[PDB]
Amino acid sequence: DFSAKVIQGSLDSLPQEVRKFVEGNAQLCQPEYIHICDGSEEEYGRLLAHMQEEGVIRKLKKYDNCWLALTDPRDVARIESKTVIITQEQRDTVPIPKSGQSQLGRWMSEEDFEKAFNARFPGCMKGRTMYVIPFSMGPLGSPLAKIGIELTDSPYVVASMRIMTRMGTSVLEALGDGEFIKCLHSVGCPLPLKKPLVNNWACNPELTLIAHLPDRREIISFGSGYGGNSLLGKKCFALRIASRLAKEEGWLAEHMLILGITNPEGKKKYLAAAFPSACGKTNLAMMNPTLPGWKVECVGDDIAWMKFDAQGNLRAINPENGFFGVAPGTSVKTNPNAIKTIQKNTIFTNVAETSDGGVYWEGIDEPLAPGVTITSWKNKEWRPQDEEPCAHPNSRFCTPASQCPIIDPAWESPEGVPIEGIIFGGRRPAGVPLVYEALSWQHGVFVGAAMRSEGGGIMHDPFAMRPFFGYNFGKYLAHWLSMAHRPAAKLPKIFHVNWFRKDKNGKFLWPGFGENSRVLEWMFGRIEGEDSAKLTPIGYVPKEDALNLKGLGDVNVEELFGISKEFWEKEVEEIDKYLEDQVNADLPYEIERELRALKQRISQM
Ligand SMILES: Nc1nc2c(ncn2[C@@H]2O[C@H](COP(=O)(O)OP(=O)(O)O)[C@@H](O)[C@H]2O)c(=O)[nH]1
Ligand SMILES: [Mn+2]
Ligand SMILES: [Mn+2]
Ligand code: NA
């Protein structure tokens, strides 16, 4: 009985299964205190002041209630190589690659995991508070929501989870005796410290391990206090566990922004889009459209949970409550809506601080007044001449979603928004035109599966889900393809975009950002069934003169929309080899058929 150690809440008022979870882990981890989070303002404010008291965070004096955490430089990112999924059979988690190295997941056996777990968690919270975070992924009480309980020894996790999910007493009330996902986290530095603390940032890099056990509905994460490793909604629950539930239950859990776009006629449609990190989800979800009379509103910028309703509409929710955005490259010029969102009640991690207590980072494109100086994320004086960036490249803002000036009115509607188009895209400097439309659902799924993006080399990132599949990618393709056999299903039109095509000198061919409204306008019209497409071997592209290019006189249209037989032969052979090596016996017939159909179309150029 751990009652004597509860410093907020009551073990007696927790649902029986929740209590079991907490007490079992209190006995294992040996926390000094147990704090059952209520999610209140008062709780939050004091937690912040305490972290400030301890030097774990700094208040940024230039803003209303903004904070800065600077990490141990060993703990700056989600770490794929220490991220695993446990299942009885390896093939259920990942396909077996012919090369002996899967790019599509990282399986761990139950046996190896039990040894790892036992080498880490016993006594790991000694002399710390175990916080109990009851959270909802999705609007509270939504039929599409799922509930988690995170145990953590990190107040930084609590504060960030209050932003990134819906947490507190109301969730425990909603939960009752329902099922929930068990989320267990420790920074893995029990007191007294065995190793020196760096930058007031508790972590255990050598023992970092982020595990998922979908068959037990557990997420178990050790040694990192950072982002996707420690905020267990966000990638572990909302993509990895959730994609497996989705497969079981007949829905989709995806790495997609969700936006609502209204045309000048006042007609509105929702679109979802899957792009990998650094390929523009935040920019698109919060776009300030350049086209007069168009409006974009943000439902979410990262995760979409989608389920066909009784009427066959594909209904999407954003299961998050906030934006955990990469800060560098965010500028007033490029992304004014994100700039407005983050000016209050935001936690920043590993950005630079100006001497007047403000935030700074690469690509902020805000000149500073003469005399204003910069402290880098490594707590050193820094000047724009310097070899190193002032902010870590993976540094973040963590901001409440409700503060986005263009947040959609239906962003928390419990039944979700009806999705009429799904967009795929990444960074392709060559070959791939600005926009194309898939010929069918099956072709659209192949376009998803074929996605590549230049991020530290050109690499495959199918559906923008490479680091996030909860189970075998081949089976995930079959799941997508199965949506076509749902009677009365209204399947979204699928498009592929490329904002990032360059000429031989390395110059972007398309201005992008707000100008992408011109491409959305074409998509909108296409969903309306307008005759604005020309057929090409890779799918439909805009007709000559179909795009509104008024205001953009010097756009190399020939190169931006060019399709080269030579490029596309190479592209299909590379896709064929990748699918063969990485997916093989688990590749659905229809994906193989689409690949052969594409090859044939190109052969006839
Ligand atoms: N050239 C160009 N860059 C873009 C565009 N959209 C976003 N970016 C840049 O890509 C980087 C990451 O963008 P962001 O929207 O944060 O991407 P996310 O990581 O997918 O959410 C930033 O430097 C952006 O300024 C675009 O349409 N064109
Ligand atoms: Mn993401
Ligand atoms: Mn983002
Ligand atoms: Na710090």
What is the full DSSP assignment across 243-288? HHHHHHHT-EEES-EEEEEE-TTS-EEEEEEE--TTSSHHHHHT--
Tell me which DSSP letter residue 238 carries: I
Ligand index nearest the alpha carbon of residue 283: 1
| Distance from Cα 67 to the centre of ligand 4, integer Å | 11
Say yes or no: 173 and 302 in one domain: no
The stretches of 59-138 forming alpha helices (DSSP H) are 90-93, 110-118
Give CA–CA dist 42/65, Å, rounded. 14
Residues 122 and 217 in one domain: yes
Distance CA 350, CA 393 (A): 9
d(CA 189, CA 182): 21
Q: Which atom of ligand 1 is nearest to the CA of 285?
A: 15
State the amino acid at position 565 in one-letter form. Answer: K
Q: Which residues contact 295 (CB under 8 A, 6 or more apart)?
A: 261, 262, 289, 406
- Technique employed here was X-ray
Question: How far, in Å, is the centroid of ligand 4 from the Cα of 225?
Answer: 11
At which of 201, 216, 250 does a domain end? 250
Nearest of 207, 289, 332, 305 to residue 249 by alpha carbon: 305
Backbone angles phi, psi at 388, to 5 degrees: -100, 155
Cα of 78 vs centre of ligand 3, distance in Å, is: 14
C-alpha 457 to ligand 2 mean position (Å):
19
Bridge partners (DSSP) of residue 374 are 354, 382
Q: Which stretch of DSSP H or E encloses residue 572?
A: helix 565-582
Query: Which numbered atom of ligand 1 lies nearest the CA of 301?
Result: 21
Kindly identify the ligand whose nearest atom is closest to the C-alpha of 328.
Answer: 1
Q: Choosing from 29, 236, 279, 398, which is the catalytic residue? A: 279
Distance CA(165)–CA(142), nearest Å, equals 14
Q: How many CB atoms lie within 10 A of CB 263?
A: 17
Residues 126, 189 contacting (CB under 8 angstroms): no
C-alpha 544/C-alpha 197 separation (Å) is 62
228 annotated ligand binder: yes
Cβ-based neighbour number of residue 290 at 10 Å: 16
Say if residue 365 is in the same domain as residue 344: yes
293 is in an annotated binding site: no
Residue nearest to atom 23 of ligand 1 (CA): 329
For ligand 1, say whether the CB of 67 is within 6 Å of any of its atoms.
no
Do residues 341 and 63 make contact, with C-beta atoms less than 8 angstroms apart? no
d(CA 490, CA 472): 26
Q: Do the annotations mark residue 515 as ligand-binding?
A: yes
The packing angle between helices 473-482 and 242-249, to 10°, is: 40
Residues 314 and 224 occupy one common structural domain: no
Shared domain check, 371 and 354: yes
Q: 276 and 230, same structural domain?
A: no
Tokens of 293: 């009379």
Q: What are the CA-CA distances from residue 187 to residues 79, 305, 395, 571 (Å)?
A: 14, 29, 19, 44
382 lines ligand 1 (CB under 6 A): no
Nearest ligand for residue 378 CA:
4
| φ/ψ of residue 316, rounded to 5 | -115, 140
Between CA 462 and CA 104 the distance in angstroms is: 9
What is the rounded distance in angstroms from the CA atom of residue 150 to the CA atom of residue 308?
29
**Overall residue count recorded for the chain in this entry:** 605
Nearest ligand to residue 203 Cα: 4
Q: Is 329 in the pocket of ligand 1 (CB under 6 A)?
A: yes
Residue nearest to atom 9 of ligand 1 (CA): 280
Q: Whose CA is nearest to atom 28 of ligand 1?
A: 512
Query: Is it true that the peptide bond before 192 is cis, omega within 30 degrees of 0?
Result: yes
Going along 525-590, which residue ranges are E strands?
A: 533-536, 539-542
* Bond before 73 cis per omega within 30 degrees: no
Q: At a CB cut-off of 8 Å and minimum separation 6, what does 217 contact?
A: 179, 180, 181, 182, 241
Instruction: Tell me how many domains the chain contains.
Output: 3
* Cβ(47)–Cβ(167) below 8 Å: no
Determine whether 491 is exposed, middle or buried from the number of CB atoms within 10 Å of its CB (0-12, 13-18, 19+): middle
CA distance 92 to 85: 10
- Residue 301 tokens read as 């910028």
Domain extent for 315:
251-320+406-605
Q: Indicate if 333 and 451 belong to the same structural domain.
A: no
The finding on whether 214 has its CB within 6 A of some atom of ligand 1 is no
Instruction: Give, for 473, the enclosing helix (H) or strand (E).
Output: helix 473-482
- Mutation test of ligand 1: which of 279, 509, 515, 560 has the most ligand atoms closer than 8 Å to its C-beta? 279
For ligand 1, atom 24, which residue shows the shortest CA distance? Answer: 329
- The pairs formed by 40-48 with CB atoms below 8 angstroms and a separation of 24 or more are 40/168, 40/169, 43/8, 44/159, 44/162, 47/155, 47/158, 47/159, 48/159
In the numeric block, which tokens belong to residue 355?
């001497």
Burial of 463 (0-12, 13-18, 19+ CB in 10 A): buried
140 vs 66: CA distance, rounded Å: 26
Q: Is the CB of 425 under 6 A from ligand 1?
A: no
Q: What DSSP letter does each residue of 129-142 carry, written as one string?
A: EEEEEEEEESSTT-
Test site for ligand 1: of 255, 283, 337, most ligand atoms within 8 A of the Cβ: 283
- Measured CA to CA, the distance from residue 252 to residue 242 in angstroms comes to 8
Residues 6+ apart with CB under 8 A from 505: none
78: annotated binding-site residue? Answer: yes
Q: What gap in Å lies between CA 84 and CA 341, rounded to an integer?
A: 34
Relative to the CA of 515, which ligand 1 atom is closest?
27
CATH of the domain at 363: 2.170.8.10
Contact 412, 243 (CB under 8 A): no
**Residue 42 and residue 52: Cα distance in Å, rounded?**
15
Instruction: Indicate the angle between helix axes 41-53 and 155-164, nearest 10 degrees.
Output: 140
| Amino acid code (one letter) for 465 | M
Ligand 1 pocket, residue 282 CB under 6 Å:
yes
Q: Rounded CA gap, 177 and 493, in Å?
A: 40
95 and 139 together in one domain: yes
Residue 298 annotated as catalytic: no
Of the three residues 378, 405, 432, the one that is the final residue of a domain is: 405
Q: Looking at the structure, do residues 393 and 259 belong to the same domain, yes or no?
A: no
Residue 527 identity:
I
Q: Which DSSP symbol is given to 289?
A: -
Angle of helix 565-582 versus helix 589-603 axis, rounded to 10: 160
514 is in an annotated binding site: yes
Q: Is 598 exposed, middle or buried (0-12, 13-18, 19+ CB in 10 A)?
A: buried
CATH number at residue 205: 3.40.449.10
Is 335 in the same domain as 440?
no
Q: Are 371 and 394 in contact (CB under 8 A)?
A: no
CA 67 to chain CA centroid, nearest Å? 22
Domain boundary among 250, 273, 295: 250
Q: What φ, ψ does residue 169 adopt, rounded to 5°?
A: -55, -45
Looking up residue 414, the CATH number of its domain turns out to be 3.90.228.20
Collect all residues with Cβ–Cβ distance below 8 Å to 283 and sequence separation of at least 6.
334, 335, 338, 513
Nearest to 584 by CA among 90, 99, 246: 99
Q: Are residues 85 and 150 in the same domain?
A: yes
Please identify, by atom number, the ligand 1 atom nearest to the C-alpha of residue 508.
Answer: 1
Q: Are residues 539 and 528 in the same domain?
A: yes
Q: Residue 424 carries which side chain, given as an amino acid letter?
A: F
Q: For residue 254, which of 483, 45, 562, 514 has the smallest C-alpha distance?
A: 483
Ligand 1 atom closest to the CA of 331, numbered from 1:
25
Q: For every residue of 414-435, which 3-state class applies, written as one string?
A: CCCEEEEEEEEECCCCCCCCCE
Which ligand number lies closest to the CA of residue 227? 2
Q: Are 375 and 351 in contact (CB under 8 A)?
A: no
Residue nearest to atom 15 of ligand 1 (CA): 280
Enter the tokens of residue 360. 């700074």
Task: Choose among 95, 79, 421, 90: nearest CA to 222.
Answer: 79
Residues paired with 541 in a beta bridge: 534
Q: Which ligand 1 atom lies nearest to the CA of residue 275?
A: 20
Q: How far apart are CA 58 and CA 70, in angstroms?
A: 9
**Single-letter residue type at 151:** L
Residue nearest to atom 25 of ligand 1 (CA): 329
Count the alpha carbons within 13 Å of 580 in the hemisphere toward its beta carbon.
7
Q: 584: helix, coil or strand?
A: helix
State yes or no: 280 annotated in a binding site.
Answer: yes
